[PDB]
């Protein structure tokens, strides 16, 4: 069953942002942080916790091929309106058992990078975000 | 028998005010304060008490999504008529067994917040009140 | 129905004082405090209340750009005549639906701040007041 070839490789992923495929993508990450409170119960030394909620966090890093990130939110942010986007990530490695696809919804970004360059260095842009909902599509 | 998961969480609660659901609810509290008089009985050292009545107090805190509180009482307060309302609170945690529903009757509010805001701060409204009678609906 | 963006933000508010727009406004607050008398009815345990009237209170905090408050009341206070003003507050958040505008009439200020400064601290002025009547203009 278990073999080295079965491990998924990051080179085979792809990301859709707002219905448009993003080709200049370096990495994509999403995570959910649960909220738990310590509760001490009389007669037991081991402490136990109660789950109260979760918080979603993530980030996207992409090569600075074009000024894509500006056109999305640059003018809307100044006026006072915040947009919400939907992202889809697909990881399809030929060696592994099929592919898994996930939709991350209600995405709101943390910052906007107007300009970042240095002599002799290739340009890159990383944007962190927070989300609320998700779906499972073709999970392995 | 006693487990950490059995503790009720306030996230799962909901409130009805005058038959209209309040989705913008932050916290709800209703309390009954008894009235007791000290009685000293000759021949015994310990002081004893006599119970005479109770007074009900509480408060509601909600986000400033809309101007709900103004339309309820603002015009009637000027004229001289004091309205009375009924509130229903249900606390249904999936991990806990059973949901408690309590109705608080004959509510009279203490104040009306016409306007309150500050730069860089989200708006919130809180309103204390006093009530007279309650009712138990499906207590655990 | 209920969304996070619907919560009103205080940054989008603005205040008019005596028909002149106040651009240097930090926070505004107007409140109405009711007067209630305890009433005990024979035969029932729960104490009840009777409503008699209301008193209005509030305060305004603003940066020390200019000497606006002095020219309003300083000379008239010495003579013995107490001026009365009218304030209008509008709260228009682009994300929220609708903007509420409330007029507060017959304002009388509580104090005058002649001078207040400290080294290495920016200057601010706050002035509480009491009012009598209000009015609703385009509530949500």
């Amino acid at each position: 069953n278990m073999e080295a070839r079965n491990v998924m490789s990051g080179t085979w992923g792809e990301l859709w942002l707002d219905g448009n495929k993003v080709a200049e993508v370096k990495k994509f990450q999403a995570k959910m942080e649960f909220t738990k409170e310590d509760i001490i119960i009389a007669g037991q030394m081991g402490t136990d916790t109660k789950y109260m909620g979760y918080k979603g966090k993530g980030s996207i890093t992409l090569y600075h091929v074009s000024s894509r990130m500006h056109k999305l939110i640059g003018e809307k942010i100044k006026r006072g309106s915040e947009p919400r986007f939907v992202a889809i990530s697909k990881l399809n490695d030929p060696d592994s058992y099929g592919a898994e696809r996930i939709a991350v919804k209600n995405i709101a970004f943390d910052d906007l990078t107007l300009a970042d360059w240095e002599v002799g260095v290739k340009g890159e842009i990383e944007a962190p975000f927070t989300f609320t909902e998700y779906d499972f599509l073709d999970i392995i | 028998n006693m487990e950490a998961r059995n503790v009720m969480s306030g996230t799962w609660g909901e409130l009805w005010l005058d038959g209209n659901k309040v989705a913008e609810v932050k916290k709800f509290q209703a309390k009954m304060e008894f009235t007791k008089e000290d009685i000293i009985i000759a021949g015994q050292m310990g002081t004893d008490t006599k119970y005479m009545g109770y007074k009900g107090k509480g408060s509601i805190t909600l986000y400033h999504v809309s101007s709900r509180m103004h339309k309820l009482i603002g015009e009637k307060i000027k004229r001289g008529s004091e309205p009375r309302f009924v509130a229903i609170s249900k606390l249904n945690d999936p991990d806990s067994y059973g949901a408690e529903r309590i109705a608080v009757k004959n509510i009279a509010f203490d104040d009306l917040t016409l306007a309150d805001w500050e730069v860089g701060v989200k708006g919130e409204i809180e309103a204390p009140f006093t009530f007279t009678e309650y009712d138990f609906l499906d207590i655990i | 129905n209920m969304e996070a963006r619907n919560v009103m933000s205080g940054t989008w508010g603005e205040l008019w004082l005596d028909g002149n727009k106040v651009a240097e406004v930090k926070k505004f607050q107007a409140k109405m405090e009711f007067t209630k008398e305890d009433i005990i009815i024979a035969g029932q345990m729960g104490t009840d209340t009777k409503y008699m009237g209301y008193k209005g209170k509030g305060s305004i905090t603003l940066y020390h750009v200019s000497s606006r408050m002095h020219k309003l009341i300083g000379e008239k206070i010495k003579r013995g005549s107490e001026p009365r003003f009218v304030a209008i507050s509008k709260l228009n958040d682009p994300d929220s639906y609708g903007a509420e505008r409330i007029a507060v009439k017959n304002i009388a200020f509580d104090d005058l701040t002649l001078a207040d400064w400290e080294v290495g601290v920016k200057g601010e002025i706050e002035a509480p007041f009491t009012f009598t009547e209000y009015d609703f203009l385009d509530i949500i």
Binding site: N92, P94, Y97, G98, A99 | - | -
Partner: protein, 50 residues
């Protein structure tokens, strides 16, 4: 889909399971579903313990 691909003559011995799903089928499309249909209350069993 696998049967149609076999009929068209391509060899599926060296085809990955995921590869078969996205292979060309011309104009034909093959889908399947799984739903459960509710019914009205028509039989009731009750046992009260004395």
């Amino acid at each position: 889909q696998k049967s149609y691909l076999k009929s068209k003559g391509v060899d599926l011995s060296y085809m990955t399971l995921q590869e078969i799903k996205e292979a060309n089928t011309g104009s034909k499309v093959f889908l399947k579903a799984k739903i459960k249909v509710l019914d009205a209350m028509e039989d009731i069993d009750l046992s009260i313990e004395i």
